[PDB]
């Protein structure tokens, strides 16, 4: 069949290859129930898209900071620097705004998961077709896909779905690496990459001092 995560091992039987990024990986059989599997598919998509946006917003400012053009703080310090620089914007007001905005959009996504296409009735400002949804985790329409890259052809949509899920998983793993590298070095990730590029046989996890506490 398709390529699997562990060659020579049969894929998990509840995974049939229809979902994007199906390499048959479910050794704990967490997706045995199909409805729970759809829920976990939406979980994976939300996690991967959030990870991709966050990894972009860490990497590109850190690359620009490393060049010396700007002085954007590292990702683990940015909240502190923002609060120190914004005394007329309290933390709780920002948190309240974020919670109500994400609550609105996430409750709309949740209610579409419970009842697919039920946000298409025109209750939110007359929007009907753009909130119907194409598939589970893939809204589409003229608002979420204004360039129409999902409505061109089927194979193009499957290609872009594969690109999305693989880059999302890579960005999730990269954010895990960001956390681990900051805990081990106390620096940013582009600082880590530059230190490794300057002297790679000396700049390794084995010489940061915490991965090997000997």
């Amino acid at each position: 069949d398709r390529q699997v995560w562990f060659p020579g091992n049969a894929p998990a039987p509840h995974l049939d290859g229809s979902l994007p990024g199906d390499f048959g990986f479910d050794p704990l059989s967490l997706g045995s129930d199909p409805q729970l599997l759809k829920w976990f598919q939406q979980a994976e998509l939300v996690h991967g898209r959030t990870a991709m946006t966050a990894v972009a917003g860490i990497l590109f400012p850190a690359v620009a900071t490393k060049a010396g053009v700007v002085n954007i703080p590292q990702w683990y310090d940015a909240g502190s620097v923002w609060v120190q620089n914004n005394p007329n914007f309290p933390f709780a007001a920002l948190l309240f705004i974020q919670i109500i905005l994400t609550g609105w959009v996430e409750t709309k996504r949740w209610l579409d998961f419970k009842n697919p296409g039920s946000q298409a009735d025109g209750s939110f400002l007359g929007v009907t077709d753009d909130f119907k949804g194409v598939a589970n985790g893939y809204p589409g329409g003229k608002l979420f896909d204004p360039f129409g890259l999902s409505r061109g052809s089927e194979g193009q949509l499957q290609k872009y779905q594969e690109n999305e899920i693989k880059n999302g998983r890579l960005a999730m793993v990269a954010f895990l690496g960001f956390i681990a590298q900051h805990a081990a070095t106390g620096k940013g990730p582009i600082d880590n990459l530059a230190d490794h590029l300057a002297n790679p046989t000396a700049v390794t996890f084995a010489t940061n001092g915490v991965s090997l506490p000997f």
């Binding site: 059989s29 967490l30 997706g31 045995s32 129930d33 729970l36």
Partner: protein
């Protein structure tokens, strides 16, 4: 996963989860608001 969630729905597992939640809630209330005698 269905059989596993059915096991997690057995009476002692539900009792463990619910009482862990209730005891943790009481403990954290008394940590954040120490020594409440009166309203």
């Amino acid at each position: 996963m269905k059989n596993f969630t059915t096991y997690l729905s057995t009476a002692p597992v539900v009792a463990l989860i619910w009482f862990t939640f209730t005891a943790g809630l009481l403990i954290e209330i008394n940590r954040f608001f120490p020594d409440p005698l009166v309203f």
